[PDB]
Amino acid sequence: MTEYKLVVVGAGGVGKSALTIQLIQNHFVDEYDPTIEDSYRKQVVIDGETCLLDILDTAGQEEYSAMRDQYMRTGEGFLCVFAINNTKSFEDIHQYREQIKRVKDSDDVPMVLVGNKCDLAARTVESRQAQDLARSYGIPYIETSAKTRQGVEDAFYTLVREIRQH
Amino acid sequence: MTEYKLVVVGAGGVGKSALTIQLIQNHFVDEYDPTIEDSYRKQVVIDGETCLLDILDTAGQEEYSAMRDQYMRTGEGFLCVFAINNTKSFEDIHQYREQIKRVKDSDDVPMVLVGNKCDLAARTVESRQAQDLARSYGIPYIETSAKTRQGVEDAFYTLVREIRQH
Amino acid sequence: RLPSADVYRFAEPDSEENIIFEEGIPIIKAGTVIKLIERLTYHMYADPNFVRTFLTTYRSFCKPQELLSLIIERFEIPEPRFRKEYIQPVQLRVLNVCRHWVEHHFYDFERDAYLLQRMEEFIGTVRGKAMKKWVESITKIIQRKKITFQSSPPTVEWHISRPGHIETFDLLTLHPIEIARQLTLLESDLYRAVQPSELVGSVWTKEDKEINSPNLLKMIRHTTNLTLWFEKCIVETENLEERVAVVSRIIEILQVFQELNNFNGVLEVVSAMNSSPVYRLDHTFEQIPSRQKKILEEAHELSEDHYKKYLAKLRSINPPCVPFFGIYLTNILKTEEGNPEVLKRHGKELINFSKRRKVAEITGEIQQYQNQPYCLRVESDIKRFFENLNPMGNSMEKEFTDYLFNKSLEIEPRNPKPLPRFPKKYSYPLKSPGVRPSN
Amino acid sequence: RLPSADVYRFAEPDSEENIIFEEGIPIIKAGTVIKLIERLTYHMYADPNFVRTFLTTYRSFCKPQELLSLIIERFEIPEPRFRKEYIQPVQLRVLNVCRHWVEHHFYDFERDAYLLQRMEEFIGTVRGKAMKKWVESITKIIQRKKITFQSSPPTVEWHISRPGHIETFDLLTLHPIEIARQLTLLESDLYRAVQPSELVGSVWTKEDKEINSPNLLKMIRHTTNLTLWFEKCIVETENLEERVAVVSRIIEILQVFQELNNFNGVLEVVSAMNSSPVYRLDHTFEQIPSRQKKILEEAHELSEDHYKKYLAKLRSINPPCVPFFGIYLTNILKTEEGNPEVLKRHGKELINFSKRRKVAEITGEIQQYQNQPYCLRVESDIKRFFENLNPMGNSMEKEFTDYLFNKSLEIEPRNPKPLPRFPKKYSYPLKSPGVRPSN
């Protein structure tokens, strides 16, 4: 089957890891061992066509700034994640995208803008502004909840579709 | 032994005095008499080389603005202190530095930027913005806690090193 | 036996609403802070491993002040006789915990003067005429907190720069072997200085990271600094011949890093090699010898498949060594964020200890690699050179990153644009003295 | 009978401070969550309709976690005998509610792992030796959650573009009948995918709309996208002759939409026709045949008098069909915002259930129209074309809207300014193959 190498990028300190973790978990399965191959590789069925998702989420390693190009190079599709309650994580998106474009030497790289929500704090980035930003890049926008798993699949499956239709 | 004359500068009303006071105190020693020579002079061992720290912290005298040049002139190394929860004390840094540079007639004066934290209020100056500001001046940035004494030594010892390597 | 009325104790008996064990000592999965502390000071047996793990990861479900209070509440046992096989051993375990706390986690007391006071008042509350003499050992620890190699380490290698000539120090002037050696010592010290209290609770990712994880950040910032200095050295070497020479020493330095088992230094170079400005310099890599390209490729493969080979090689080697820290960071953060802080049973709230144990194992692994020191001679001047490197100058990240990339485009413009020639920069021989030591 | 002391039950008798009925089963108007849940699990009779309505609209006056707790509190009935006509049936209704909940509203459990846990623990708490065997059916549902037409559907119609030639696909290249057919399939699927949990509680209007109503918004965004693509096709067709041809196919596509009973697609075109840029193109509509002007006028009249005719036509037709969603949205929002959340009686606070029932009826009507599928052959390539349309490009709403209007002014300047001529854009025949199928 086809193997898609996905990479997650975004500001640290706002829980971006919840994205990839929630995907790779089942109902009542709140256990997680970031060492097994099953922790970052999942096989799914998207639009009838079954495939394998390989997800790189270097969360916790943000200070290793000079290591971003290396990590980014490994993927063929990207999830630019920001926190709906942290404006700075939103404003950081533009630079991450410029970096992805530069490493893959291309103006149109399969990527999607994902806005993650944490039920604790207040929203400071309205859907419209994230919607407008996504349209200026010509990529899809997908909001997700870290507490209810709502939107998580859609986020990843959408990126896969962006790769296929490329 | 070598005697280093250190001077602390920064906005008042945000507790900058906690810096020099916490340095000159021992575990379970919360007593302080700002009149004894022991209150501003401490002998320490830095990088194996033992020395004497003479610290001038004119806290409380901020209204005597025209007296700053006089006081600043006395030192050979400076600690530009701001409160991590008071943005105005942060924005005030630039002018203090211009003043230190002018009195010592030099573009590179041994100084360090120290960001003090008070557990009571919320952070309004992120580490990155203080980090960026420190790099634009070509000086080290050191965060410290007024409640746990974390970072206090590092702050002072770093300044000493800046003097030696000058 | 027959303990107190529960309305005066930790007497509540084990149930499914109290403790859950992992499916000779029973491993705890979860439980109330009460039941947790009970097992930490169990009368049946002593659990030195559970005490080591609890004192390393408790601050995420209990505050230091609350812990001391619970410990004191555990010590002061009320009689309902046979309480010599219960009161004597429980009070013993409580005091062994206090000792371990003050010995291996004194930072808790340096950060809260009152916490220490309550501890000193409590220690001075011990009654037993025999216990006082034993408890004096604990008091001594508090008052206190307030390696011949087989062969002689190899000779400091030198090249174009002579010892003492700091001004001349640079990437091609120093001996490639010594560069890797001194960077390994620097990087080993930096690695050995990180405390578990900088990692536990994903503390280096929160807003108070500069305060709580100063050693970790100091280590990562060095790695970043060097990756960038390598890029700057390459990219600012405009003459193709000289640039090939520059890329060559760096690969040589990578080789010695591999020999010295300095993985931080390996990924340091690999990262510079895979950076945007350096990666596309096709004209440069073209003239790089085959053997060196393979050394680099072999190095790059360590990262592949999520560091599968790196993780394997780390296990297969014998220390000293400098592991790559990032992987540990990602594993601690994900272990903490990917597992619940509390398990629910019959409507009661039990603390997920298993999660804290998993963190402690990663922490433990880190500490194991901090033991063995390097059999290498320190060269103070060369060490100061790499300690004072500042590739970025006064520029911000992006401004500098963009400069490197625009420099790459200038020295090797895109395809249809012919490769221009640039004047020589270095006025000394570019021949490497090699990677093999003198004798 | 003789129930418990009220200090251990739902035993509080009906009063004007408990329940109010609508003026064989009594319809509830309002009542305490207690009395509401009592009637939802009434011993006298079963109320499958009240159970369907309550589980669809309760989240606005009770949280899922609180509901499970109330249900459990309703099940655990204490004895004061004749309690076989009370305890046996009440426990039965409670379990039938749990079944309905897990069957038709599993999203509540996918969103809260602990909610499912409490449900699995509760299900496993059933005592009755006979009840366990019956309750196994409920457990099976939980584990699970973790049409020949008369004649063969009509042939896919083709025009200038041949099957497979994606590059050539466009508004005049594809067959007008097939365009309407594929847009109807696309629009039908989009319509059939909206869940009542995206509408209830006016959830698509709040700040978390992208999260809670992803299907609804995806449907509305398609409608908007097409209305805009029609405008762009018209307005960017600078040559008057070609523009008249473009406006003509669109009216033709409207005709087939009407035939296929695709109201979303009807108002899609009507909206483009009445938009500012298209509405004022007097020179274009001048040369549009009479019959087509009447088809369009007949279409525009559906909106008049607050959709009086559209609402009438929807009722008069036999599915399949794609209703216009907007009206339902406005009715749910206004029903919820225009009626109180609580009725006050004798100083007590009763939940207005009638309001929730009114919402459920609109929701129900929506779901009814999601049953019947279209007897139409899907053409994957044409479907992908309309799925990938992006008239706006990278422009924001206003920037694009302004562009369309400035384009309208350019192709048909205001009165005193003479109508200029523009060059031909299309290099293929503009004759429509017609709206009548081959055979």
The secondary structure of C10-55 as a DSSP string is S-PPP-TTTEEE---PPPEEEE-HHHHHHHHT-SS---HHHHHHHH
C contacts of D72 (beta carbons < 8 Å): none
The minimum CA-CA distance between A166 and chain C, rounded to whole Å, is: 23
CATH number of the domain where residue C313 is located:
1.10.840.10
C contacts of D114 (beta carbons < 8 Å): 344
Q: Letter for the amino acid at C228?
A: L
Residue tagged 């409920």 (tokens): D138
Count structural domains, chain A: 1
Question: Among A30, A35, A65, whose Cβ lies nearest the Cβ of C340?
Answer: A30
Residues in chain D that come right before a backbone break, where C and next N are over 2.5 Å apart: 23, 80, 146
Contact A20, A155 (CB under 8 A): no
Dihedral of alpha carbons D282, D286, D292, D297, sign? positive
- Residues spanned by the domain of C60: 1-146+326-368
Phi and psi of A42, rounded to 5°?
-135, 140
CATH number of the domain where residue C106 is located:
1.20.870.10
Strand partners, C30: C20, C352
Going by C-beta distance under 8 Å and a sequence separation of 6 or more, which residues neighbour residue C309? C301, C302
**C405 vs A: CB within 8 A:** yes
Contact D53, D104 (CB under 8 A): no
As given in the structure block, the two tokens for residue D160 are: 């200038």
Cα–Cα nearest to A63, from D255, C309, C120, C225: C225
Measuring CA to CA, how many Å separate D362 from each of C240, D61, D194, D327? 74, 19, 13, 10
- 3-state SS, residue C62: coil
Contact D276, D405 (CB under 8 A): yes
Please tell me whether residues D126 and D208 are part of one structural domain: no
Indicate the helix (H) or strand (E) that contains D250: helix D240-259
Do strands D348-352 and D342-345 pair parallel, antiparallel, or not at all (unpaired)? antiparallel
Question: Among A123, A150, A165, whose Cβ lies nearest the Cβ of D207?
Answer: A123
Distance CA D73, CA C108 (A): 46
Please tell me whether residues C400 and C253 are part of one structural domain: yes
User: Please, what is the end-to-end C-alpha distance for chain B in angstroms?
Assistant: 18
Query: What burial letters (b/e) apply to D135-154, b meaning 16+ CB within 10 Å?
Result: beebeebbeeeeeeeeeeee
C contacts of A60 (beta carbons < 8 Å): 202, 204-205, 326, 329-334
Mutation for testing the C interface, residue in D73, D121, D122 having most C CBs under 10 Å: D121
- Identify the domain boundary among C368, C399, C426: C368
Going by C-beta distance under 8 Å and a sequence separation of 6 or more, which residues neighbour residue D209? A127, D203, D217
Indicate the helix (H) or strand (E) that contains A84: none
DSSP sequence for D309-356 = HHHHHHHHS-S--B--SHHHHHHHHHHHHSS-SEEEETTEEEEEHHHH
Binding site listing of B for GTP:
13-18, 29-35, 59-60, 116-119, 145-147
D contacts of A165 (beta carbons < 8 Å): 388
Burial of C372 (0-12, 13-18, 19+ CB in 10 A): middle
C273: DSSP letter: H
As given in the structure block, the two tokens for residue B12 are: 């008042």
Subunit contact B117:C211, Cβ cutoff 8 A: yes
Do strands A77-83 and A2-10 pair parallel, antiparallel, or not at all (unpaired)? parallel
Distance CA D224, CA D222 (A): 5
Residue tagged 């790459």 (tokens): C408
Chain centroid to CA B166: 18
Distance CA A60, CA A13 (A): 8
Please tell me whether residues D163 and D185 are part of one structural domain: yes
Subunit contact C209:B138, Cβ cutoff 8 A: no
Strand partners, B116: B83, B144
Going by C-beta distance under 8 Å and a sequence separation of 6 or more, which residues neighbour residue C419? C240, C283, C412, C413
Subunit contact A60:C207, Cβ cutoff 8 A: no
CATH number of the domain where residue A121 is located:
3.40.50.300
D contacts of A123 (beta carbons < 8 Å): 207-208
**A2 vs D: CB within 8 A:** no
Q: Letter for the amino acid at D132?
A: K
- 3-state SS, residue B101: helix
**B129 vs C: CB within 8 A:** no
Measuring CA to CA, how many Å separate D217 from each of A116, C90, D185, D207, D296? 18, 63, 18, 13, 27
As given in the structure block, the two tokens for residue A22 are: 């929630």
Q: Letter for the amino acid at C25?
A: I
**C354 vs A: CB within 8 A:** no
The minimum CA-CA distance between C56 and chain D, rounded to whole Å, is: 29
**D117 vs A: CB within 8 A:** yes
The minimum CA-CA distance between A96 and chain C, rounded to whole Å, is: 11
Please tell me whether residues C348 and C431 are part of one structural domain: no
Chain C from 312 to 331: CB within 8 A of any B CB: none
Indicate the helix (H) or strand (E) that contains B33: none
Distance CA C340, CA C356 (A): 11
Subunit contact C275:A66, Cβ cutoff 8 A: yes
Please tell me whether residues D142 and D170 are part of one structural domain: no
Please tell me whether residues D265 and D330 are part of one structural domain: no
Cα–Cα nearest to C123, from C142, C100, C107: C142
Measure the CA angle with vertex C365, ends C362 and C367; round to 5°: 115
Phi and psi of D288, rounded to 5°?
-95, 125
Please tell me whether residues C297 and C421 are part of one structural domain: yes
As given in the structure block, the two tokens for residue A75 are: 């993927």
Count structural domains, chain D: 2
Distance CA D197, CA D189 (A): 17
Residue C205: closest C-alpha in chain A: A13
Contact B78, B160 (CB under 8 A): no
Subunit contact A58:C397, Cβ cutoff 8 A: no
Going by C-beta distance under 8 Å and a sequence separation of 6 or more, which residues neighbour residue D421? D239, D240
Residue tagged 């401070």 (tokens): D17
Subunit contact A65:C397, Cβ cutoff 8 A: yes
**A62 vs C: CB within 8 A:** yes
The minimum CA-CA distance between A49 and chain C, rounded to whole Å, is: 24
Distance CA A30, CA A48 (A): 28
Measuring CA to CA, how many Å separate D335 from each of D57, D199, D215, D331, D387? 13, 12, 22, 6, 34
CB atoms within 10 A of CB C164: 8
Dihedral of alpha carbons B154, B157, B159, B164, sign? negative
C308: DSSP letter: H
**Annotated binding residue A117:** yes
Indicate the helix (H) or strand (E) that contains D164: none
**Three-class DSSP labels, C313-344:** HHHHCCCCCECCCHHHHHHHHHHHHCCCCEEE
Burial of B105 (0-12, 13-18, 19+ CB in 10 A): exposed
Distance CA C139, CA C64 (A): 19
Question: Among A28, A141, A154, whose Cβ lies nearest the Cβ of D117?
Answer: A28
**Annotated binding residue A54:** no
The minimum CA-CA distance between C100 and chain A, rounded to whole Å, is: 29
A contacts of C331 (beta carbons < 8 Å): 34-35, 60
- 3-state SS, residue C267: helix
Q: Letter for the amino acid at C162?
A: R
Please tell me whether residues D107 and D186 are part of one structural domain: no
Declared resolution, Å? 2.8
Interface A:C, Cβ pairs < 8 A: 93
Phi and psi of C151, rounded to 5°?
-95, 160
Going by C-beta distance under 8 Å and a sequence separation of 6 or more, which residues neighbour residue D352? D29, D30, D339, D340, D341, D342, D343
Measuring CA to CA, how many Å separate B166 from each of A62, C79, D245? 33, 68, 81
A37: DSSP letter: G
Cα–Cα nearest to A25, from D113, D398, C212: D113
- 3-state SS, residue B56: strand
Phi and psi of C43, rounded to 5°?
-75, -35
Mutation for testing the B interface, residue in C120, C211, C218 having most B CBs under 10 Å: C211
Mutation for testing the D interface, residue in A21, A23, A113, A148 having most D CBs under 10 Å: A148
As given in the structure block, the two tokens for residue A10 are: 């975004």
Subunit contact C224:A66, Cβ cutoff 8 A: yes
**A108 vs C: CB within 8 A:** no
DSSP sequence for C198-212 = GTGGGTTTSTTHHHH
Interface B:C, Cβ pairs < 8 A: 51
- Residues spanned by the domain of B12: 1-166
Distance CA A98, CA C397 (A): 14
Distance CA D209, CA C394 (A): 45
Q: Cα Rg for chain B, rounded, in angstroms?
A: 15
- Identify the domain boundary among C336, C368, C400: C368
- 3-state SS, residue C60: helix
**Annotated binding residue A12:** no
- 3-state SS, residue C152: coil
Burial of D155 (0-12, 13-18, 19+ CB in 10 A): exposed
Contact C351, C31 (CB under 8 A): yes
**C267 vs A: CB within 8 A:** yes
Mutation for testing the A interface, residue in C232, C333, C409 having most A CBs under 10 Å: C333
Method: X-ray
Going by C-beta distance under 8 Å and a sequence separation of 6 or more, which residues neighbour residue C231? A66, C272, C275, C277, C278, C391, C404
- 3-state SS, residue B47: coil
Distance CA D74, CA D171 (A): 62
